[model samples]
Target: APDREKALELAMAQIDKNFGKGSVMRLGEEVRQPISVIPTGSISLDVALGIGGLPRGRVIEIYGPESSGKTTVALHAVANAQAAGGIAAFIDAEHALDPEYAKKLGVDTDSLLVSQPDTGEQALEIADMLVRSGALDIIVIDSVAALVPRAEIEGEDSHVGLQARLMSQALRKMTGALNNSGTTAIFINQTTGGKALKFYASVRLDVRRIETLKDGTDAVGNRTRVKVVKNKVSPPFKQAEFDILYGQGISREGSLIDMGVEHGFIRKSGSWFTYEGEQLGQGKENARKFLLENTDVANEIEKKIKEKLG
Candidate 1:
């Protein structure tokens, strides 16, 4: 009996190691840890988000109006996935994704897979297949609002013909597959005049543009307002701000010195400050340069901010 049990155990290990499928282990043998997350590029966001970051192996939805920083955050997630040595699939249902903007987000064009599906049915089918295949690490469905109902596109429909219903059905299967396969699924949705069909999302986010940082009449950047509508990883109704420069990604540097001074990382001396016994920046250019070259100070200040947030 003991020899037969050993043989079965060895087979389980082989299945887990080689194919990453089927693992049988006792409850006590299983490792325990907090929910895993995929960083969203902004260390400030990474710390304040309900999970340490965007949750992995879960269904996440971001819905908002245009110019609300929706695409920026989603693209950052794609970049983050690739940076972690994982491949990503981007489902651009509306064909609205700007390749140039994707470049600005530093998305690896070589490794990222892009697909354009006209109908909601086709898009969900593709997502389901990808999840079941278990080959990709991250999958993004951009703007589900643009996906058309199969019957609407074909002009043959009864009351049961609805994109929302079809989407909910597909999510039931895809979400289960994601849980088992360890793939994180992100859905880019948009707000509308009527009811929204976002019940399938485990984590729902609402993004808004709170303020525009402008120089004269020319807008330089905007600060994002991120609200968690629902979160399974941590408490709900959590909020955080993410600042974005026009061409640059997330920029905390412009405010980095001010934040550092507030958090005691830099000692303010009248118009100037000192960090680590070295004089801090005095002008705009000098400040940006200082934050760019000194990450050790930035990282420490980030810790203090995170602590303060908690």
Candidate 2:
């Protein structure tokens, strides 16, 4: 053991002589640069994030329960990326992607590329192939869990840790490849056990479910909320509350008089505000009815949000 110690010291000394002290590159920087800002599709979300957009080379993870607007936000980002004159890609591992819905959202389908891979490795391979092709502005991996096989993830702790490491490595390579070409990447993740997915991403967004207040003698329905779980470039733990209107669009209940822009079933919060205050409740009810009547509109609104806000 003592003899081995000197050999180790000599080896380290040689390494330092060749590479210099503090020469081992940092993790985030080596693979990708920190995204200075991430643009929230909604002004409220953006303001809360304190940046107009996400950082250049960083990855963002979004996670939430079912029907909590997880995919909705990703679609918005795709639209945003395309609107910015950059091509965007989505690797759909779950087979849940609906092109018809995406088209309704007003996403530039021509500029957007969708890839469906059967396995995680296949998905990564496809992503790598796309990145190497230099044809995209942003890349979105639909899911992290679906990429790896169930057999490899026998336990929660071990599986999640392994998944995180694999994702980190993949992200590093993806970011590095994209950075070299000045492109950006975004990854979509599902939440587990109420935990936000931001821990593994450069930026994370959490969508919460919110119930609409029932009016007297009116039938009550479901709604949702959006929050910023973690953001490195902007303030962390800020919240943005939004309601999903069925066919008409999404609106912010706090400010209903503004009648904000409408795309499918989603609208800006400011647009829904009314000086009368009571009108917003009615607006929400109307939105609910609209959603029920026009299921397709929900998809359309999602697409618009992606195109306009993402």
For every candidate structure, what is the RMSD over all alpha carbons to the true structure, in angstroms?
9.1, 12.0
- lDDT per residue for candidate 2 within 33-118, as digits (tens), equals 33444344544565445455565555677767776666766776676667767688888887888766666654688667878876
lDDT of each: 0.73, 0.57
Could you give candidate 1's per-residue lDDT for residues 92-156 as a string of tens digits?
A: 87777777777778788777898888778888898889788888778998887777787887778
Model 2 residue 264 distance off true place after TM-score fit, in angstroms = 27
Q: How close is candidate 2 to the true structure, as a TM-score?
A: 0.61
Model 1 TM-score, all chains together:
0.78
RMSD (CA, Å), candidate 2 to true, equals 12.0
| Worst ten in a row by lDDT for model 2 | 254-263
lDDT of 2 at 171: 60
**Candidate 1 displacement at residue 161 in angstroms:** 1.1
